[PDB]
Design a protein around this ligand. Sequence first.
Ligand SMILES: [Ca+2]
Ligand SMILES: [Ca+2]
Ligand SMILES: [Cl-]
Ligand SMILES: [Cl-]
Ligand SMILES: [Cl-]
Ligand code: NA
Ligand SMILES: [Zn+2]
Length: 638
Amino acid sequence: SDININLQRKSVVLGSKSNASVKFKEKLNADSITLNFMCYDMPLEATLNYNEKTDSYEGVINYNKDPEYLNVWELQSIKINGKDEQKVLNKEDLESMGLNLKDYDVTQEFIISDANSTKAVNEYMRKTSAPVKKLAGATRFETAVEISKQGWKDGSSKVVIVNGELAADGITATPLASTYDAPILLANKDDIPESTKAELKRLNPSDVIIIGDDGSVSQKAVSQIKSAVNVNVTRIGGVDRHETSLLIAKEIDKYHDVNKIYIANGYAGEYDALNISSKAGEDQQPIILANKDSVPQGTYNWLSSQGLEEAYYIGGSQSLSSKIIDQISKIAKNGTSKNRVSGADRHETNANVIKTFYPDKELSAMLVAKSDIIVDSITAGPLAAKLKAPILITPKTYVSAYHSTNLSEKTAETVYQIGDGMKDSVINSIASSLSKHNAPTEPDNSGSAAGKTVVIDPGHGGSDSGATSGLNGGAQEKKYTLNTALATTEYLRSKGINVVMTRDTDKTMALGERTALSNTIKPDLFTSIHYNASNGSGNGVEIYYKVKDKNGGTTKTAASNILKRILEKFNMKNRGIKTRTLDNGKDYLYVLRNNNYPAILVECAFIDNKSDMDKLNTAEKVKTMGTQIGIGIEDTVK
Ligand SMILES: [Ca+2]
Ligand SMILES: [Ca+2]
Ligand SMILES: [Cl-]
Ligand SMILES: [Cl-]
Ligand SMILES: [Cl-]
Ligand code: NA
Ligand SMILES: [Zn+2]
């Protein structure tokens, strides 16, 4: 077209930055142009400088003005800053050149104050939350259309199409859609629904790129797409997911060099591929799908000739073994095991990718999708890549415990809610944490208007490592209690029980602070999680409970239930439930003696006993230990 205006963000807050690129068919003989916008009577301008590499005017809009009234910035004009002549295109001129100016409107939202119930006012401290933009429709097809309208309101010359019910197949499509700066819309194998047909017409593309062979998206779907818009249809699809990821990588290499790869297990690491999608999309570098010990030969031969600078492995040892790291490390400049990112499950892996690949404490945005489906994260991917923002996944009814630290420490200017189905409670909890640094950890439980509440306490932390041992490559009680406790919290939340963790990260915390927290929360049950030690000798599981219940009571029932559940998955010696007192008759353990609520202390296993530790030598086994403890707790409080 004669003029194309590409704005990075259509939803901002005070202080946001948005990249802008304007391309003119005509050579203007001018080093820069100035865009003028207005919101009611307040002006905002941005100067874009000519970049000969791209034949485009590029720069950044800084939303550093706070409007007294209204909150939508509307483009008014473009001034061409020639040396000898300046020309100004006003609204009428821009409309005469084919632009529809409302396609460039940018909404400036602000942090809202609401809490969960401002029924009158009792104190003065309102809970704040980052503004939420919801992109969703009745089904995955309409949700992909709302995403498309958000980042491509002015249209797109290319559209990527993936089969919407075989979405696992388009899991490596985000980096290519990002390279094209195109949205992904969804098809059925032999048709496209009306929602996709109408958005293809609205975007007015010249080309549709189908990912998948005719078995995924057939010629019958191709005809319905061309009936909607008579585009050129390109198809990229191999014999299986591994070859298709290779063919996508070769397609990206036609636009710019491929020198970095993010590897995931094709059939066993679908959520690994999904979790690194927004980052691979922002970098416009491919996701290469592999087998557990190697990438296929065809992939290996092409990667060997690419001169890779970096390779990352998304997935644990069971998905990508040391053999594929050895293979790829030999052909990449930086591809050692240090580049592995993994997690006990899809949520921990999502949190570790965000922690590793989005290190900034202030994000421009956070896109939040349900973790039970794959397709919403695939269609959100191109938009997350355009916004240079991560996708967070979590179940519909609770914020995963593995997100606690990232949500507390970081802020995001805008939170996008992808799809319909996530509880208000959950998205609002995430939006509140992301409105401040070092945010407190609390809406994550507030979720239930009523229900049972448990306090989970991972023993030791920070300056106190607790017991240590040389088993399982070196073990520290403070880290095993934290990994066990996160899994217990995750199980309880998935059953609708509110959980407050005394700590959700490595930090120093005194017994008196853990107990004060318990006394403030007034839980149904407080569970401290620890690991035992003696020498290699002691082994087994034991739980301490309050002496006052020695002949019956909530803590004795709690300790019996948890011990039973642990033993259901772990063949360790049953050391029984125990009480222990000081000479004065009171409980020896501070968190039992000083707790006004039911409390127990679980010694999961002896961290210095090889037989016990052999049953806890992978993140998934530690996760099973936490889950059993959570089941025992649910037995007790439900
Ligand atoms: Ca665009
Ligand atoms: Ca190397
Ligand atoms: Cl946006
Ligand atoms: Cl930006
Ligand atoms: Cl005391
Ligand atoms: Na935060
Ligand atoms: Zn301990």
